[PDB]
Structure formats: C-alpha cells, structure tokens
Amino acid sequence: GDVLSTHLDDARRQHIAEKTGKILTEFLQFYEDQYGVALFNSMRHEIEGTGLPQAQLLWRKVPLDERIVFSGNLFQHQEDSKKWRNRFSLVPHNYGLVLYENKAAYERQVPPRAVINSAGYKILTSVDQYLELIGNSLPGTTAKLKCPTQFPLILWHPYARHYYFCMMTEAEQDKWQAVLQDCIRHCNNGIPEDSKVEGPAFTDAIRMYRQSKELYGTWEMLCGNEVQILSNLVMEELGPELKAELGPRLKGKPQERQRQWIQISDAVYHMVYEQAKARFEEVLSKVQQVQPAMQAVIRTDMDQIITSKEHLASKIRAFILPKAEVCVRNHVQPYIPSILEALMVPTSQGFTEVRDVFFKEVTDMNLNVINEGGIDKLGEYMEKLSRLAYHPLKMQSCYEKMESLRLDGLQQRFDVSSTSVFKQRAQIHMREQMDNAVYTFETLLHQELGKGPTKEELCKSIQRVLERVLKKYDYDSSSVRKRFFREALLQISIPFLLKKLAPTCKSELPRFQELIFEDFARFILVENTYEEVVLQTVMKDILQAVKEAAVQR
C-alpha cells in the first residue's frame, strides 16, 4: 500500500494520539495555572490605572471593507499525479492562499482545490535552496523536483506539507514572493497582541511547558493561532522518536525518502491539530465559565493578593537575588548595548521608511487635488490611501529594512530564532503604525473639511492635517519602539538567566508554595513570582540601556 496506509496504520495512529494526549494534558495544566495569573495582572493594571498610555494616533475600529488582496495564474506541482497544472491563485481579505483549477472555474463559483493558511511557512526561490533545507531531515545522508519555468516559489513548513509553484517571469515571481511573505506574516500574527488575558496566559503557558522540558529562549514556532502553536509544540516533541522509528522503514533514494517523511509528517500534523483543537477549546470554555467568579475575588481581595505576592517575592529575593545580580553583572549587562544596537538600527530605519511612504502617498493625493482643482474625487483618493498599510508593493520597502537584522544570543553567537521572531514582530508594528497614520489622516481630514471646500485652498488644510498626523506619528513611533526594544531585551536576557539559575532554584522553589494562601493560588504562582524577581534584576540595566542610547529618539 501507499506510504500513509503502510506507516500510519490504525495502531500507529493510536499510539501517536496517546502521546499527543499526554502532552496536551501537561500543557493544559500549565495553561489553567497561568490563566488566573494573567487575569489578575490585567485586572491590576486596569484597576490601578497603570496600563499602556493612550496613543496619539487613532486606531481603526472596524476593518476595511473586504477586498481580494491579489490574484493571478500560477503553475503548481500536484502531489498525486506528479504533474504541473495551472491554478488560478487568489489571496482573499484574510490572507489565505486559495487555489482554483482555473479562473473560469472560479467565475462559475466552483469550490477551491485548496485553502492554505501559511503560518509557520518559509519561502524558497530555488529548488536547490529547498533541497538543501530538507537534505538532512533524515540522518546519515552524507555518510556514504523539476519545474517547467526558471522562476519557482516553494513553501516549506517544518511539519506540514510543502507546496511547489512556479511563475513564467521574474516579475511574477517577485510579486508573488511579496504577497506570500505578507500572507505568512499575517497568519503568523494569530494571537492579538492586545489580548488582555487569553493571549498572555497561552504564551506564558507555552514558555513554562517548554522550560519544564529544559527548552529555554525564543521559539521560532510560536507563530499562528493557539491550535497551530499547540500542534507545533506536539510535533517538536514527538517528531524525533517518530522519525527514528519510521525513517529506517522508508525505501528509496535519499530525496525520495525525504519526500515520504514530509508526507507522513503532514498527516501527523493534521491528526495532532484536530486533537489539540478539541482539547484546548474544551479547557478555554471551562476557564471562561469561572472567569467571572475569579474577577469578583480579584476585585474584592486585590490589596491582600498584592500583599501576599510581595511577601512571597521577599522570601524568593532573599534566596536568589545575590546569585542573580552577579549573573546579570558578569554575563548580561556587558552585552545589552550591543544587542540593543543590533535591533535599533533596522527597526528605526523601518519606522522612518513607513513615515516617508506615508508622506509621499499623502502628497501624491495632494497633487491630484491641485490637478483637478477640486474636492470632488477625494473619496476615490481616500479609499486608496485607506488601504496603504496592506498595499503588497508600497509597504515592501519598509519591511525590507528588517532583513539586515542579525542578533546574537547571550552565548555571543548568532541567534537564528530571536532574529526571525523579532523581524516578524517589528514588521507587524510597522503595519499597525501605517494603518493608524492613514486612519488618523482620514478621520482628521474629514473633520477639517467640515469647515468648507475653500475657506482656504484645500491643499493647505491637507498639508496642515498631514503635519498634525506626522507629529502624532513621531510620538507613537518612539513609544512603540521603546516598548519593542525593552520587550526584546527582556525576551533574550531572562531565559538566559533562568537557565543559568536553574541548578540553584528548580529543586528549591516548591518549598515556597506553603507561603501562598490557598484561596489565592489561582492568582499567585511560585514560578511566576520567581520569574518576576529575576526580571527586576535586569530592569535597571535595560531601561538605562534604552535610556542612555535613547534609541527611541
């Protein structure tokens, strides 16, 4: 039989589901523990009024009207037939990649042949690059795919299936590379950053689970929505032993064996995804049911919870602060300036490029008003400007500023994962700030225009509204960048410290549990309090490094 029927038979699928279920159970215990802590922290910020200050730019409240992002014909390699077929390929408003047999089939409202969420994917523009990337997916390879055009585009994922496209011209290749890069970035941004409770509870639980498996530091596969990330977590853990078991059973030449493993991995990824979805959504519903009860206890007992948290922290400080401060002084503090410099330069270039692109587009609109000498086509020009933050070409020069980013870890070595994650996060911030700029410009211009078509010439109020939005932009850009640099420095330095401190602490921390009043245990965790103690040991150096640099400008 075929590869999947042979190697993923019912018995093997049951074993995989059992192992997956054990991982999900352990993760969900971390998640339920984290949930009340995330709730307490968010409520403390709101009640004490210590959340993020209000931005100067306005934020769009309703999404833009849904429009197709891009479409065109592509060739796609077909896994079943091994034949290349034309496909009409469409990117909807939500940045899925949708493939139809042809455009005529699309017009007749025929179902799509595939709908692809590209979270966790990477783009390759040559077959050799792709073969190099998968070349060591099975062991011992060095211990002794052919495209109809010269312009391929390949989508690779560590666990899910790979897609093979090609285009007729370098121009089409370049366009689809930008669009698919936008798709990946959009799908990776699957948990809203301003989620108050669910987001932080989930991502902290992921980190704590990984730490319990002795995995510290930024994780490249913390991308996509919750179920995708959980699927990545399971595949990371189960992949090695599944590969060790099935690898020797695969028959053929090295690249054929590599392709069979990709097919097996995708099938397991699907099975894991559905199992994780069911298990996670069950627990999410359970925590949401008791969240109001938790809110009442937090609101009533706020001051006593803070007191209990501070008492626990004081005992942890007494235990770990000497060794922590030495480790920061000797092994973190010397390197904070260099890491900050590496992050600041491309990030600040990118935010400045957003400003320049915004300024040019508003001026181009202003030129149109002067040329028609009138207000009457403003709605047409504002509609195009309203979408600038999602323009598949015009934003590319901003995003490109991040590709020179190279970050060392605290072993003074290039950190691939930190670099990847922080380029993605920086680019998402750039998209947000561009959208805020054009939304603010539109809103303020409409206000200004209530004065009348020519109380003074329209191009004077346009340029005055533009100058007002630019000052709001410059303020918000510095706010956003300072927060981003602080967050990134913390996310590089704290996992390093926790790993160095683990032989001292991991056996000893449970002894502090007895200090937590049982009715507060959903809101206070020994581990989280300990991690906050460690965080405070780098806070001075980080705030001062971002201060002394004044990197936020």
Numbering used by the authors: 2 to 145, 152 to 560
Quote the original article.
FAM129B (family with sequence similarity 129, member B), also known as MINERVA (melanoma invasion by ERK), is a member of a small family of proteins that includes FAM129A and FAM129C, which are present only in vertebrates. Following the first identification of MINERVA as a target of ERK phosphorylation, several studies have reported that MINERVA is upregulated in many types of cancer, including breast, kidney, large intestine, lung and endometrial cancers as well as hematopoietic and central nervous system tumors. Overall, MINERVA modulates crosstalk among essential cellular signaling pathways for cell proliferation, invasion, and apoptosis. Sequence and secondary structure analyses of 746 amino acid-long MINERVA protein indicate a PH domain on the N-terminus (residues Asp66–Gly197) and a proline-rich region on the C-terminus (residues Asp575–Phe746) which contains the phosphorylatable serine residues.
Here, we report the first crystal structure of MINERVA lacking the C-terminal flexible region, which contains the PH domain and a helix bundle domain with a novel fold. The trypsin digestion greatly aided production of large single crystals of MINERVAΔC suitable for data collection, and hence was implemented for crystallizations of the native and SeMet-substituted MINERVAΔC. Using the SeMet-substituted structure as a molecular replacement (MR) model, we could successfully resolve the native MINERVAΔC structure for residues Gly2–Lys145 and Leu152–Arg560 at higher resolution. The structure of MINERVAΔC could be divided into two domains, the PH domain (residues Ile69–Asn196) and a helix bundle domain comprising the rest of the molecule, which exhibits a distorted L-shape where the PH domain is held at the corner of the helix bundle. The overall architecture of the helix bundle domain resembles no other known structure, as analyzed by Dali structural similarity search algorithm, suggesting that it is of a novel fold. The N-terminal PH domain is tightly held by the helix bundle domain that acts as a pincer-like scaffold, with a large contact area of 1573.4 Å2. The N-terminal PH domain adopts a typical fold of a PH domain containing a central curved antiparallel β-sheet (β5↑-β6↓-β7↑-β1↓-β2↑-β3↓-β4↑) followed by a C-terminal α-helix, α5. The spatial arrangement of the two domains allows the N-terminus of the protein to be located adjacent to the PH domain in proximity, presumably for cooperative action of myristoylated Gly2 residue and the PH domain for membrane localization of MINERVA. Surface representation of the protein reveals that MINERVA possesses a positively charged patch on its membrane-interacting face, which is mainly composed of positively charged residues Lys83, Lys84, Arg86, Lys104, Arg109, Arg114, Lys145, and Lys153 of the PH domain and Arg256, Lys258, and Lys260 of the helix bundle domain, presumably enabling stable interactions of MINERVA with the plasma membrane (top view).
